[PDB]
Each structure stands twice: as structure tokens, then as C-alpha cells.
Amino acid sequence: NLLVLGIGISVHKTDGVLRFEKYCQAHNLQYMIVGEGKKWNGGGQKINELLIALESIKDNKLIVVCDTYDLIPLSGPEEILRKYRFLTPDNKVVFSSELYCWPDASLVERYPKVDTKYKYLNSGAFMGYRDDIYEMIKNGVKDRDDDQLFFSIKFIETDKIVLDYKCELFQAMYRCNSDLVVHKNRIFNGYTNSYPVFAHGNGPAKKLLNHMEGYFMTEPIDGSSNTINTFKLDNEPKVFFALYVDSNDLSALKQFLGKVASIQYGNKVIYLYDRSDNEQNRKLIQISYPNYHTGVTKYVFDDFKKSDAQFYFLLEQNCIITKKDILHELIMQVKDNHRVISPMIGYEQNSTRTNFWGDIEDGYYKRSENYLDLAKHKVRGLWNVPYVYGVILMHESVVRNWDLSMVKYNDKDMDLCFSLRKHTIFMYMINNNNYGYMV
């Protein structure tokens, strides 16, 4: 009765596609990921891989076709089918609407005139019968052709497409901040008076969807999650501790190593990466920590990749961990699209200054609407944020499969986060407990 075709063309899965899959599963939506396992080469490749997928669907199924990296469903098939039937009694293909006419601004005068601001087609989500969609795309396109232009022209030049002007099925979120609010585990659009099913953080609006993600749920919360706030795994995966130290500040080095040594975890290997090139501390340090390296000024992944460890645990010398069972606690949260997790810590004398950024502007720190709420623990959980620092747990499927060594901002911590953002790998801050402090 319904199949969702999510476009997810990549050799390795992004967190965007993993999040999409989790929300489909939560809402009982049957899906397939179009292009899974293939190399990405705009957006016409979406149409070409779609055509392949449709060729293998024999019968005339009702389908949704949608983006995955920046999009989640918030309801299930029953609501979707009610809305489709209302929107198009004669079974045409329904496309998302949006605020802007692109990529060809000259189509403005060829679109139907409407009272609403939601005037134009967005190709990132649509719904209709397999045969009808197949008929429109059956000749293929160029990989580097624009899929949005392709369908905009079809809308203007044929009677095959209807636009979702009232945002019943689909929401293109960009520049619609003032219309949207989180209410009862949904987005409500007060301009249209609707609860859109598919939330599309199109273009820069990935930041708004990622912001809202921490307020949605895929299942009711277990309110006893932290009633007992001690954690111990049944089976411990191997964790590679990557310690970024500076023996030029010997007092800080000693304080930090003492705290790391008190983290309770059996199945570990510890590497020290010292930015100093002065060899005078090697004898003393190596007695306790043989895997000691000097003159290191970048984050290092080669030792990890050559190991059999399952997790990379990055620790900076100015981050003091006091919660001894923290690795057990953190590993219990690594599932689905949660693969990079950073415990929230603040300066002792200044607890509003923490190791995460809630927002970013032109690459630098911006105060988000919920930053102070998070930093003061007014709400707790996992939070999709643009930058995390100094205490970072990463699953091997991130470190082994993606380039984390891209350069833009020169500072090692800013370039790690830049790399993750570029790959659609999400950083989750966690503030469930008192974990430590920065010095």
C-alpha cells in the first residue's frame, strides 16, 4: 500500500541516511535506499538511479520519492495516504512546494498565480504511482543535469503534477522558521494550518532540522533512563584512547593523565600525542605510557586504523573527566545514526563556557536559541550540534571510512568538525550527567 524510495547514493552510509532510516522504521514506513553502496557523481544522478530502482519495481505501486540526508518522516502510511487522496482525487504526482523559484528565475512568469507564498516546486520530495513517475523520467538525464529544473518544467508544461501548496505532505523548511513550531512530537505550520509529514531541511535549513531533532522522539522516552546513573557494559568493545597532550605545561599534563588513568575501562589501548618536541620528559612519561609520540600538531588516525579497536576516544589535556564509568555510559548511546558523541563539560569558574557550539555563522561560534538551556541542564539528552571539542567518542565506521583530515580553519578541533559536517556525519553532545570540567 506504500513504498518510500529515499535517495542515498554513497559507498558508505552518512548519518543523514541512518537518521532517515530510523525515522522510517519508527513510523512503520516500508522503504528502500536508492543508490546505496554506489559512488556519487545538479542532482540528475538522482533521476538516473531512481529509473534503475523503478525498473525493478514491476507493479504499479504508490511511492514517495525523497531526499534522505536532510529529511525525516514524522508520521506513518495511514496519514500519508489520507492526505494523498485528498490532494489528488485523480491520482496525479504531488510535489513539495517552496518559497523560491530555482534554478531558472525566468519560470516565475510561467507558474500558476496563487495567493500563497509557497508558490514553486521543490524536487526533494514527491509522491505518486510508479508508472506515472517512470513515464516522466524513462529517457534518463545527464548526471550533472538539475533534477529540480527537470520537474519544474514538467509541472509548467504538462498536467501531470499537483503542488502541495498547504504543506500537508511535505515541508521545505528553508526561510520558513517563523511558520514552524515543534508541538506534540510534530512540526506545526501555522501559516498553512498543517502538520507536514516529511520535514525537509533543504539547503541551509539542515541547521533548523538538526536543531529540532533533539526535541523529537522515535519512541516514548524511558523516564527511568538515569534513575540509576551508574553504567557497566556486559561486553566491552575495544577502545583506542587518543590523548592530545603538551608536556610544555607539565602541571596540566600530570593532572590530566591522573584523571584519565582513573577512567574505569578494561578493554583499551592508550596512545599519547605530545605537541612538545622537547625529549626531556620522555623517560618519565614512557615508564607509564609506552605509546608516546612527540612533535604532533594534528589529530592522528593512522595508529587507530592499523589497530583492531572498535572506538576512537579523543581526549584533550584541558578536559578533566571525573565520571569514572563514562565510557560505559557513552557506548550505550552508540546505535543507529548516533556514532559521534561528546560529553558536555564547562569551565569550573564559568560553566556557561562549554565544549560545544549550538550554532555556527561563517564557520565561527554563534549562540543558539537553546544553548543556555543545554549548558544549565534545563533539558537533557542527545543534541545534534555543529561543533564539539576535547572529549569525543567515535565509532570505527566513521573513522575507518571517511576523510577526517580536511583543512579549512587550521585549528585541529575546528577542522575535525568541519570534516564531519561536510560528510553529513552528525556530532551529538550529551548532557545526561556531571562528566567533568575544562581548565
Place this chain on the structure above:
Amino acid sequence: DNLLVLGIGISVHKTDGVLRFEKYCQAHNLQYMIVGEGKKWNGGNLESEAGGGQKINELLIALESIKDNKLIVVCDTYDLIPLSGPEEILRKYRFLTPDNKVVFSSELYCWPDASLVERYPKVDTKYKYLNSGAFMGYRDDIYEMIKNGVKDRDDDQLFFSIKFIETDKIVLDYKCELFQAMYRCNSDLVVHKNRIFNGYTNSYPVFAHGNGPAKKLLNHMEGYFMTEPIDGSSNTINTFKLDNEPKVFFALYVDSNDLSALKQFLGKVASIQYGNKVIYLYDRSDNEQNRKLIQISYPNYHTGVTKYVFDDFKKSDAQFYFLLEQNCIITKKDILHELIMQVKDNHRVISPMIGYEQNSTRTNFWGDIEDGYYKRSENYLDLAKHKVRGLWNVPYVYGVILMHESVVRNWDLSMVKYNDKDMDLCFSLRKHTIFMYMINNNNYGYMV
């Protein structure tokens, strides 16, 4: 494993408070019984005095019929809802008391005897004192404490406070894991993921208790909670029609001293689409000169009326009472169909939100009240501008009100406090724990 919730609901007729409790219990698969159903309350005026001993007396009676040693929750129902189910409750109980003691709610204040302050255990937290509106333990242990009974007008909270201080039978839920007494805890509490989160204790309390004046906080939060995922297509089609119309009694409050206003209003009322109706006109005018003309169109016409009247309705076979004031202009013709479709469970009094024609953010509901008059609530403007839509539990509604017969037939809606018909109707409903729901789902009309 097993759990039974014993909600205290001593009344001949059910309040909306108990109906809301029952709905949330059912939503969370909590097995429950209502203690005291069918009996008259004789426990005192708890809004302004000590009391509540009758709750212990009716509990005792109820426990006599639970022969085996079941794990039970006992709780208030008029101002209290559960937000999770039995699995979470049992995990928390077992963590809080490995030796199976009776767990009581905590609260901020030492009530009703302020001199017990020096007798309580000293603790770091502000949640220092016992609240008897929710507790959990084994039937035999609770039975043992209450087996002799008390006076109906005795204070139940005092009774258990003394037991906590003088025995080892009770422990307090200091961290608000099972229970939250919400009064004066506003800054601690936030709505998040269909729960209350307490940032002071770092907990998600199961039972949300609007104790004392905090009924206003719980009623406010109610509009943001759900008992089931919402149906996002609820207003995709915004026309409504009942094929089998229940009988509706239209009670029109009119003033023929402004004849042009009266005619404009009646022309809108006559375009409300509804067949199975009876229409009464209650005119505040004492001038009889318009009787002959009006009665041609509306034979059920009465003059000199300055109060809301329910006796004609009670003599009828109508199932709903639809109150309409002359300055309320209804433009949505299918409105009664729309409103009747929302009447279920604890939703029995429903008022469509309309604004003044020249000033749409001044509406026919009040979000808060101070010494009886309007006060601006935290979400009033959001509601007035349709930033969020639905049903909202508010202290005052005016001018367009649909009431189920189970309210009108069974409760005194004619109590006097302000000597003002609209203010005194809402006062009466608040007194009885009958809730007023504003609804803002569609464009309904306007006030003049």
C-alpha cells in the same frame, strides 16, 4: 509484574478531573479503580482549610475487598495525571526502596502543621516534606497504618506526616522519580518529549500533581501533552457534518434595546446549519414593544432576563446546551457539527475562539486570572494568533459555549461570587472541577 492504581474520586457524579485521570491511566495501560464513586464528599474545603480524612476512610473500605498483598499506588485524581506506565513505575519503586517500604511524594512546604519543621529529617534538598496526594507500597503495609480509621474532617496529610516522622514505614521520594507536587516548582519543570522534566532533581516524574493552586500549571501543560500520537490530517478537510444530529438547545442571550444588533445576530444564528434544535431567546430588555414581531420568528421568547437560565433546558430532552451572546457573530456555518465531534471523555465544555472585529488578539477566553479578572498567560498570544491549534484548558470562556447535558443536568452552574453572569458561570465550573476548553482549530467568527 502487577500493579493496581487506586485513585480517590469521591463524588455522586464524575468531575472532569477524574475523567482526565482515567483517560491518562488508560493511555499508559495502567490498571486502576476509582475509590468512592457514587458517594458524597465530606472531607472539607481543601482550597482553604485542612481536611481530607474521608479519603483514608474510603481507602480503608476499599482495601477490605483487596484481600491479597498487592503492590498499589494511591493518589489524588482531581488535579493529577500519570505520564508513564507500569514498567517504569515498578523499576523506580524497586530502586527507591529495596526493602519494600511505602514511598510518599515530597513537596516544598510543611502543611498543615508548620511546627513539624523541627521534627522532620534534615536533608540538603528543598523537597523536604511529605505530600499525601500520591504514594505507593504494599496493601498490607498501607492497611496496617490506616486500619483504625480517622475523622472525615481530619487532615490526611498530617496523618501520614506523623507516621513518617514517628515510624520506619515510609520513605520520601526526594528526587521526584515517581511523584511531582508541582506547587511553586515552576522554575524546575519543563515539558519535553511528552513528559515533565525536573531539572533540579534530574528526573522525569511519573505522576504530575497540580497540588494546591498548581492546578493552573497542570491545566496549562495539559494542552501540550498527548495520550496518543496526533492525527496530522485532523483539519486537512475542514468541513464537518453529523448524519445523526443529537438534539441541541440554543440559549440566545439578547438585548432588544439594540434592535439592529439583535437582527444582525439572529441572521447569523439562523444560518448555523443544524436541524435537530430548539431555540430560546432570553432578552434583557423590559420593553414589551418588540414581542409580537420577534415571536413570529422565535416563539420561545422571554423578557427581563439578566442571568443565564437552565430550567427550560432541563425540562427538554436536549443532549447539549449551546449558549450564544448577541455580541458574538458566528460565520462558520458547520460549527456545531465541528464542536460536537470534540465532545468526549473529559472534554465536555467547549468554546470556539473569536476575537474582536477591530482587534483580533482580544478574544473570548482568558488564559489566566488574578483576583477574578483577566491576566495574560505565557501562551495567550500564541493561541490568539493561531501559532498552535487544538483544545486548551483555560479558566474563563465567554459568549459561545457548547455544554454536554451531563454537566448542565448534574451540577450547580448558578453559584455567585462576582455578581456577573459570564464570570460566575466560569467560577462555578472551576469550583466543580469541570474544565473549560477553548478551541482554535478554524476561523469561527468575531465579537462586536
